[PDB]
Amino acid sequence: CAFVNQPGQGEALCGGCTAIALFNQANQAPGFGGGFKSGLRGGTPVTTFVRGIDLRSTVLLNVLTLPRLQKQFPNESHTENQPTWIKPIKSNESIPASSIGFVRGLFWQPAHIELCDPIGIGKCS
RNA sequence: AUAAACCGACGGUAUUGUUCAGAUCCUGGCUUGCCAACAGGAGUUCCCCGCGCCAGCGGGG
Ligand SMILES: [Zn+2]
């Protein structure tokens, strides 16, 4: 990578593309190895999205309707439905799959990271 | 001056040892190459040297 790639692409990043970077790292990226875990699907899951003429239409096409949403995710439950940052994960915890809310699952991040304090105005790398 | 630029897939290695292709076998029998025929007209025989020259005679190669 150091040999073949352009440097300074991670020098400075906008809030948007850092949110995107974070979500991507949480979902489709395989890092960081070591004492770091990926989830919930696993390492390098493949995403399949229906596409439309427009972004709006695309996002809406990939949304689950309320009855089917309820069907795929049986709310039964003892299910906590708060995100990783709202209600944190407990270390070494044994979490049953069915106990995860459809909210907690979609925005699940096991990375356990904080964004350092921002800086001023400039071009995003 | 291009997903470009700068840019080895690299180093190490017997395919080795043993082994008759052997024994039997006539290519045999029959066939004219025959018919015709002056070699004679011609003195050119290429190079030098000596002596002759209506002639030619010699000496070398
Ligand atoms: Zn940016």
From Swiss-Prot:
Outline the inducing conditions.
Answer: Repressed by H-NS, activated by LeuO. Activated by the BaeSR two-component regulatory system, possibly due to envelope stress. Part of the casABCDE-ygbT-ygbF operon.
Q: What happens when the gene is disrupted?
A: Loss of resistance to bacteriophage lambda infection, loss of plasmid silencing.
Q: In UniProt terms, what function does this protein have?
A: CRISPR (clustered regularly interspaced short palindromic repeat), is an adaptive immune system that provides protection against mobile genetic elements (viruses, transposable elements and conjugative plasmids). CRISPR clusters contain sequences complementary to antecedent mobile elements and target invading nucleic acids. CRISPR clusters are transcribed and processed into CRISPR RNA (crRNA). A component of Cascade, which participates in CRISPR interference, the third stage of CRISPR immunity. Cascade binds both crRNA and in a sequence-specific manner negatively supercoiled dsDNA target. This leads to the formation of an R-loop in which the crRNA binds the target DNA, displacing the noncomplementary strand. Cas3 is recruited to Cascade, probably via interactions with CasA, nicks target DNA and then unwinds and cleaves the target, leading to DNA degradation and invader neutralization.
This chain's protein is named CRISPR system Cascade subunit CasA
The Swiss-Prot or TrEMBL record describes its family as follows: Belongs to the CRISPR associated protein CasA/Cse1 family. Type I-E/Ecoli subfamily.
Oligomer status and interactors: Part of the Cascade ribonucleoprotein complex, with stoichiometry CasA(1),CasB(2),CasC(6),CasD(1),CasE(1)-crRNA(1). Interacts directly with the 5' end of crRNA, CasB, CasD and CasE. Binding of target ssRNA or dsDNA causes a conformational change in the Cascade complex; CasA is required for high affinity target DNA binding. Interacts with Cas3 once Cascade has recognized target DNA.
What gene is behind this protein? casA
Domain of life per record: Bacteria
